[PDB]
Amino acid sequence: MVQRWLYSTNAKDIAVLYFMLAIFSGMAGTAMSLIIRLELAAPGSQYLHGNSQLFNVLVVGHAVLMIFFLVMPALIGGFGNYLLPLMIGATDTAFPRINNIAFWVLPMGLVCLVTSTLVESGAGTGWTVYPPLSSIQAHSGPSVDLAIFALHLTSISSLLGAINFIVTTLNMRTNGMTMHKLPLFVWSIFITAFLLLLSLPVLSAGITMLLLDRNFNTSFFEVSGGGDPILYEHLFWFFGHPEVYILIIPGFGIISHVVSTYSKKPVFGEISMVYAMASIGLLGFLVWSHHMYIVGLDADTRAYFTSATMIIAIPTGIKIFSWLATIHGGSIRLATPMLYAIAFLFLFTMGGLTGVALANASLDVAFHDTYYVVGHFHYVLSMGAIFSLFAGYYYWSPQILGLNYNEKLAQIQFWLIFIGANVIFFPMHFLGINGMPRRIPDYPDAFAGWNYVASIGSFIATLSLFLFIYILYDQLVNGLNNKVNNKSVIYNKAPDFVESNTIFNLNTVKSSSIEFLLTSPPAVHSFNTPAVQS
Amino acid sequence: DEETFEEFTARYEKEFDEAYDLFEVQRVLNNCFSYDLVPAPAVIEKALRAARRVNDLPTAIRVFEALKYKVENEDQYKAYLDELKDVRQELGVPLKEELFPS
Amino acid sequence: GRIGESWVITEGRRLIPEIFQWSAVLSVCLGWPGAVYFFSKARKA
Amino acid sequence: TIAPITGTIKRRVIMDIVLGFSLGGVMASYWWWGFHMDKINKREKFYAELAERKK
Amino acid sequence: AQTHALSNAAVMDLQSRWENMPSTEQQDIVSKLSERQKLPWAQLTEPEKQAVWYISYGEWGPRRPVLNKGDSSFIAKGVAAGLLFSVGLFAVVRMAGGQDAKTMNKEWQLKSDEYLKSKNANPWGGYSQVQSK
Amino acid sequence: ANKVIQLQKIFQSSTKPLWWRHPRSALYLYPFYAIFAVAVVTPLLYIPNAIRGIKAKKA
Amino acid sequence: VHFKDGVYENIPFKVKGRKTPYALSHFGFFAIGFAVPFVACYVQLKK
Ligand code: HEA
Ligand code: HEA
Ligand SMILES: CCCCCCCCCCCCCCCC(=O)OC[C@H](COP(=O)(O)OCCN)OC(=O)CCCCCCCCCCCCCCC
Ligand SMILES: CCCCCCCCCCCCCCCC(=O)OC[C@H](COP(=O)(O)OCCN)OC(=O)CCCCCCCCCCCCCCC
Ligand SMILES: CCCCCCCCCCCCCCCC(=O)OC[C@H](COP(=O)(O)OCCN)OC(=O)CCCCCCCCCCCCCCC
Ligand SMILES: [Ca+2]
Ligand SMILES: [Cu+2]
Ligand SMILES: [Mg+2]
DSSP states (O other): OHHHHHSOOSHHHHHHHHHHHHHHHHHHHHHHHHHHHHHTSSSSOSSSOSOHHHHHHHHHHHHHHHIIIIIIIIIIIIIHHHHTTTTTTOSSOSSHHHHHHHHHHHHHHHHHHHHHHHSSSOOOSOSSOOTTTSSTTTSOSSHHHHHHHHHHHHHHHHHHHHHHHHHHHHHSOOTTOOGGGOOHHHHHHHHHHHHHHHHHHHHHHHHHHHHHHHHSOOOSSOTTTTOOTHHHHHHHHHHHHHHHHHHHHHHHHHHHHHHHHHTTSOOTTHHHHHHHHHHHHHHHTTOGGGTTTTSOOOHHHHHHHHHHHHHTHHHHHHHHHHHHHHHTTSOOOOOHHHHHHHHHHHHHHHHHHHHHHHHOTTTHHHHTTBHHHHHHHHIIIIIIIIIHHHHHHHHHHHHHHSOOOOHHHHHHHHHHHHHHHHHHHSHHHHHHHTTOBSSOSSOOTTSHHHHHHHHHHHHHHHHHHHHHHHHHHHHHHSHHHHHHSSSSOSOSSOOOTTOOHHHHHTSOOOOSSGGGTSOSSOOTTOOSSOOOOO | OOOOHHHHHHHHHHHHHHOOSHHHHHHHHHHHHSSSBOOOHHHHHHHHHHHHHTTOHHHHHHHHHHHHHHSSSSHHHHHHHHHTHHHHHHHTOOOSTTTSOO | OOOSSOHHHHHHHHHHHHHHHHHHHHHHHHHTHHHHHHHSGGGTO | OOOOOBOHHHHHHHHHHHHHHHHHHHHHHHIIIIIIHHHHHHHHHHHHHHHHHHO | OOOSOOOHHHHTTHHHHTTTSOHHHHHHHHHHHHHHTTSOGGGSOHHHHHHHHHHHHSSSGGGOOSSOSSHHHHHHHHHHHHHHHHHHHHHHHHHTSOOOOTTOSHHHHHHHHHHHHHTTOSSSSOOOOOOOO | OOOHHHHHHHHHSOOSOTTTOSTTHHHHHHHHHHHHHHHHHHHHHTHHHHHHTOOOOOO | OOOOOSSSTTSSSOOSSOSSOHHHHHHHHHHHHHHHHHHHHHHHHHO
């Protein structure tokens, strides 16, 4: 068993390893989020005895952990490496040793991030690593270097997996599959791979310039030397907004599939969904300077960037309305992936509308570095990535594990994370619009009420997570029992309203995707003969 | 291209006449009723004939039960099941509501 | 044609419950912090 | 006989669309004409009293 | 085709006892009913018709719904137990916390209101920070 | 030297892992394994002094 | 290459044939995942 997991070269074992590291680091990011929200419950130093440096360190640990080590490994790595060779009928993805080195370069990024947290002071620079705060004059010690190396190792992983995904879905399709006949999750991870490939160079450039300023006495960003800190903001946000579209677009893939398979009707205008995802992917790279409306850009530059940022509301609206058109007129079977899809729809529309109010450069005067932007981004990130992750897990885990999960516990877990995430991220808009600044361990004591109700919501969210990792244990030890009693949902699609039960039993899986006719846990090398398609 | 109503009627008459076993009768009936129109009573008459020809009772009850869940009023269901009174009397299928009286 | 009651009647009888139920559901989903401020001490009660 | 009954979902979709736009317009008409107009009336009343005490 | 009729001992009340009938008796009843199908359907008795309808479209097996009759109450009671347990844990780890700020008093916040009223801050909104006891 | 046909025969007719199939494989593989073990043991070993504060003495 | 496949051969860990309980390893994994930031907070506050 040393070979199959350490020396691994098939995509599914790499995928479950990606998912395991993703959920380990997501547990750690949730713990850091709990500690942040615990310290931010009441004014005055409650738990961290003073020590705003430790609070900032936990802020970058929580942020970089939940982005680069939970959502990106889970969504990209685990779901891509399981379904992207499967949903196109490929045997095993091209360059599987690149597919193995990307996974195995991730958890040492986790190791050096943890040791950045442990060494002399910790990186307390925010998740954006802005100079001269992250330079050597404000942050001495080797900590921000190790956080930079964590970002470099996960940048290597994201780029190499992106190359692997592009040539897998281009070169290794099955024989009947034209590019137009592809699924939406495969198209989604294709477009995400292209945005990774075209974004991570600028991140690597800006981060290595930061490292060169820190340790080799050069001045890309040091004012004493002629350097300009706004260059790092330009480089980091040319990575950064393509990055957040990278995080959201696999959710746009998963939600199309769970919505079409739990409404029992196909996606409304699927080629328009391909065009809308590609339009969002092209339009990301042109809007990157909405994150810096404050630095003193020209009025024509901001008047451009608010229009460019607003233009992306149109294709995301086309996607969010075609999902409503898929759910309209169908026969809804409200299992937990359908619950996570509906909640994704509503709460991502709310986060996107707060983002549209954030797109205006005259209003981002009033909202920059307030808790309004953390309302916006925790809405789109939390719902549109965690609900997408939970929908993907409860959707594909009976198939890729052979073990059905408890359904009543799944719906109480959904409901608890629904109301808990709402209770934590709704008063952030109130704190922001009343002028509470960002990244503070303490506040004026007029913010204590909404900080209290959000800190009450955090315990609900952590209880739903503890319940979810109980659902994992209950799935792993009693999955076959869950199939044989009535504690789960065996059939994702019920019979239609004419169909007999034996006529159903001869044809028990009716999907437009390959993965559900594969055997529970699938063959170690399936597709001996290639999967034919008309 | 969109089909007019009589073109739909001709197509599903031909389909129900060509259906040859129980999987085909239930398939033709499933995508017969999954449009935005209650089918014409000639189509339902051909559906009951085709369910009789494959010797299966309960799909011929499901014709009327799907017609009940498909039609928009409670009066058009009456207009349908009194215009199919002689066909349902000849085959001898019940409605589901007079089969399970509650 | 037009067998039965009109589409106005038979869809208003479905919609008029759903308007009130939607208003209740959204007023809970959006106006829940009003209860916390209502029971709170900053209303001086 | 039975007249052809077709297209219930189209009438249902346009009825749901205009009911949703009118419901959201009722929400936003309350938002503007109550809340924003109330705040603007309070501010204009304060600046009227301020100019009066400046006289 | 087949014999006279399915007996009432073997076909009556088939809804209550389909899911407890063993698979062999299920298969034998299904076989005899499929042989009874080819007769002209006036000659079927009423428990036979109910058995055939429940076998093909009854709420068993594949037509079993997602939540079976007690699960909605169980998920409501579960989410209520989660809310009460989580605010109990919040009360516990809040009780193991640091001291309050010295400015979290009714009398301190009244003097803050007094200072703000002397500066006439927040003139058409609220300026009073009281919020505490 | 055109060892391609002979190495095709050796490489395809072998129940060994692919990095071991050449006759000169141990000649690379043993010192690489020792040097790799040293090079991944030592910087992990210097982490307690990093998190303790003890910089390296300049001697 | 030909590995074993089936219900529990898809995963790295060992659930069924096991000396210790599975709940030990399954909750110790998530427990050290949840307690990594407490180790970080303890080290930084001791400093
Ligand atoms: C991935 C994106 C992501 C997600 C999901 C979250 C989720 C949460 N975050 Fe955070 N956060 C950020 C990304 C995210 N955050 C970023 C980028 C910053 C910026 C830092 C800066 O500005 O400097 C930030 C900062 C930030 C702040 C602002 C603090 C400040 O700057 O002053 C707060 C405030 O409470 C917070 C807390 C929380 C809490 C309580 C959750 C809760 O939602 C936790 C509940 C979530 C779960 C329980 C997830 C489920 C767990 C899993 C492991 C998924 C399992 C599913 C599968 C494996 C399929 N984090
Ligand atoms: C999940 C990833 C994600 C997604 C998808 C988005 C989506 C959007 N974001 Fe956001 N954003 C972040 C992650 C994301 N963001 C992060 C992490 C930050 C903080 C970074 C930091 O500070 O470090 C941030 C901050 C951020 C800023 C910077 C503000 C500041 O720092 O001062 C801005 C400014 O324009 C912005 C706007 C938008 C807009 C317009 C969209 C749009 O794409 C949303 C599109 C969706 C809709 C528009 C709704 C659906 C459409 C309809 C229902 C149709 C009807 C709608 C209309 C007619 C408008 N967000
Ligand atoms: C601005 C308005 C749009 C906003 C966005 C839409 C809302 C999002 C949710 C959509 C859910 C339903 C989608 C699936 C339906 C479907 O797919 O229907 C498919 C049918 C097919 O018709 P056919 O067989 O004749 O043609 C077959 C060949 N095409 O086409 C329709 O029904 C037509 C519906 C027309 C809608 C007109 C809207 C009029 C109101 C505009 C706003 C007025 C505001 C007034 C305020 C006082
Ligand atoms: C705090 C802010 C958020 C507040 C949220 C609302 C407050 C309530 C919290 C939840 C209480 C638990 C109730 C459990 C219900 C139950 O038990 O469901 C059981 C029901 C009925 O079952 P049955 O008819 O088959 O028969 C059972 C009896 N034999 O099935 C369902 O699941 C369907 C109902 C859920 C619909 C999907 C909702 C998905 C999320 C939507 C997100 C918002 C979109 C809408 C926005 C306007
Ligand atoms: C931790 C305590 C271990 C105690 C062992 C005692 C040994 C005595 C003998 C007992 C029997 C043998 C035990 C060894 C076997 C073992 O347990 O697997 C050992 C491994 C690590 O082992 P290690 O290298 O840390 O062990 C040191 C000694 N060799 O655990 C784990 O991966 C735990 C993993 C947690 C489960 C994760 C659940 C989530 C999975 C999601 C998958 C689905 C993905 C779907 C989406 C793609
Ligand atoms: Ca605090
Ligand atoms: Cu952005
Ligand atoms: Mg800023």
